[model samples]
Target chain A: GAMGDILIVWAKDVDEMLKQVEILRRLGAKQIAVESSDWRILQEALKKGGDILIVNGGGMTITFRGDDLEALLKAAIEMIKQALKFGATIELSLDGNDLNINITGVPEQVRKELAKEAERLAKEFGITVTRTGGGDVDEMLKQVEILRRLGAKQIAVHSDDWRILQEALK
Target chain B: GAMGDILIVWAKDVDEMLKQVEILRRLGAKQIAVESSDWRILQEALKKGGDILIVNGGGMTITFRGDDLEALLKAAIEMIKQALKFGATIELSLDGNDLNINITGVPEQVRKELAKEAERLAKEFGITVTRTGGGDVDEMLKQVEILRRLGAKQIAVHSDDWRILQEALK
Candidate 1:
């Protein structure tokens, strides 16, 4: 047992938090400790492991924290199944002619059609489109490097690989 | 042919807008004039009516405007299928310890389960629950009146009945 390392992974939502924790488990995390007041997160964390901690008051942080925290907050957007559960809202913002949209979950088929529909709007409305997905650290790193070369204002990547996470935070 | 009545209903999102227009149709709307630059709404309006007029742009109005305009906006919550397409995003808000949430579209079955989950949140978190649905104007009015008596801070209703709409706007 690799009991040499203890790491803390914090997140605002359970799904992303668990995804990170699962990666940690794969990488030989000795024990997992979750810090959240949300019952759903706590309940799911319970099923995931025996080592769970509940902190009633902890400063919450953004889930999509990465290389460009400053830019990504107002720029990056992602999809979710339950916005309320995640403490997000169902709304849109058009500030200074910038089109920032975060879609809630839709079926795969409907999501595909919706992409086609919204991508068309992105062009006509003179706006940019930012779509997200799950990928291995390598694929994410490759994408990040290319995006940086392409003059991306901000980039976000999720990975258990400390190296990749390090580079992303940089 | 009742051309004497020309009611202009302005809404930010297309689905809610379309629903309102459909109600207007039953009430003898001679011609439907849609004011917006969004292609999706205009295209859908074309399919719904032969007498569709498109204005280049218009000041978008709130979708949920009612007796609770002061309260409903930062309060009432509803479900939607396509957030981006409807010019909305997926988000939740908690301001001044007040929990306000809007859910994106989920299958009715999943939605039912989600409600159970969030309603659980409503109780455990020491907050009130706000759920929304569609109903005939009369039923809506009945609910609104009852809610008003129950001391609801805000109330929202959608109806084709001018009388009902008038009551809500008031």
Candidate 2:
């Protein structure tokens, strides 16, 4: 089945992690990626078993892990595929801490390729990219322009900022 | 540090489960209780390590579980204590499927006892209470009256609700 949204959450501790998990789950995000500094908290997330698993790789970097890397990749593929479900927006920034973007109905191969690019970018930035796979570059870019109308630099978006984002997206 | 709110969520599948978790977490509910029919989903929550766990016990019955029963009780106590930190309200119905009520500061032992009662009630109703605890009857009732003006059959409320509840009690 197609999951709804790909949500990335950052937390400092178990309580925060759990809360983020609870909130994201409620908000209809199927692929939830939780990031935390505490390894023990990550351990807790591992037990919960979701779409994405990010650990604190020190130096403010995030790394991914899960029970099944293959399953995680498939989930990432689904997330990217779902992003192209409609006239979805794909937002990208020039110099952002992360390559945060909005994706709408795109090809699975392109989504996979974009995922690969994201992994590569993270690696180039010296951030850990534990799991990486993708389709092709040209195909990915082709879809990017199609979703460009909704593109913009969204800087400093906190978890609490979703209400505004939700309204804007609507 | 004290967590903000105790949120309860019900999900039947992974996507639903994840969304509920995300929503509650985003709402600043420190303690979240998730209920699901899929045991794997429950396992996921258990792995995530949160405040509450609930499982489908068949026949329209539900079960609750947490990492630590004792810890869950302590959390319940804290929730009640926090409710009293500021003037808070309590609501109870003469007849309902569940004994829904508001809690305020009470003796530690009483909280523990009330937790026991909730556990017992859960069991009698064929509902599993994995984590349970509460405060004194009189004190719980005393604060209940003060907060009665805010009464409603609120099966659930978020952290933000408490702030409003506090002001109403005052």
Candidate 3:
């Protein structure tokens, strides 16, 4: 019995998927909805609004309202702006007609705020966001820093495992 | 002049009162209720519904609805949680009272969650969480914190002078 509810988690690139996994493990929540195809899960998450979300981005492509091309282009521009603001770098590519954007070197705060806001905006526009991170060191480190500094007293930040991150914050 | 048709705003501390003032000003509310005792104002708010609240620390101590301190205690806790969670912060005092719990440094996120849960619990316990903050800054802040933490996303906050925080957020 798989809880009769299939959970899908998404990741833009392998890195993002690995990152998402750590978050899931921290929350101790099971039965996820995941996808690494980016838009597929984002589209689904938005369509079905819920409490928690995680997004995987390969580059800086924005997927507004599930419009793949436009979102990718928008995300590209936003990524550039963010990178410039945060002194970071990113990469963009295409696979099977899907324009993917991969970004890294972004500040922890910037990433968190972006992810939180993006999910909010996505949900507002009927976009479902899901990402998986399977024990990535960098992502885990970022999460740790987040907990140590911002979450020293948060009480909700339980464990550093991938499963916990799944339901880390509602 | 009874000013019978007023919106009572009970408060716990100065900061909590300030929040109510801020919110009321935003809604263009004028002539709020106040008291030297929060407990009196709380009961009065229940009795008055949309009447002026006489606010003060007394409301914090008054036994609402029954001999059990649950009503008064939970309401005060809710207000504290609401204020901290809604990005409203200011000094509060239970110094005059025993304040045996010694609760301190309540964060916004958790405070917000706790206040919401308290409200739900109060409702289940048959205590109506209506019109808790209405006095000047002190009363408003108290009510705002309680309501906000108790799960009133729509709860608005202003400031001691009212227009300052309102215009800033706007």
Candidate 1 TM-score versus the reference:
0.21
Q: Give interface RMSD (Å), model 1.
A: 25.5
> What is the per-candidate TM-score for chain B?
0.31, 0.31, 0.28
lDDT of 3 at B149: 39
Looking at candidate 2, what is the lDDT of residue A20? 62
> How would you encode candidate 2's per-residue C-alpha lDDT over A88-113 as one tens digit per residue?
22221111122223332234444455
**What stretches of model 1 exceed 4 Å from their correct place?**
A1-170, B1-98, B134-170
Give per-residue CA lDDT, model 3, range A4-97, as digits (tens).
Answer: 1222343454445445445544544343333332433433333433222323322233333344544433443343344434433322333322
lDDT of 1 by residue, A99-132 (tens): 3333322223443554554445444434455443
Please list the C-alpha lDDT of all candidates, in the order they appear.
0.36, 0.35, 0.35
TM-score of 3: 0.22
Give the DockQ-based CAPRI class for model 1. incorrect
Of models 2 and 3, which has the larger lDDT?
2
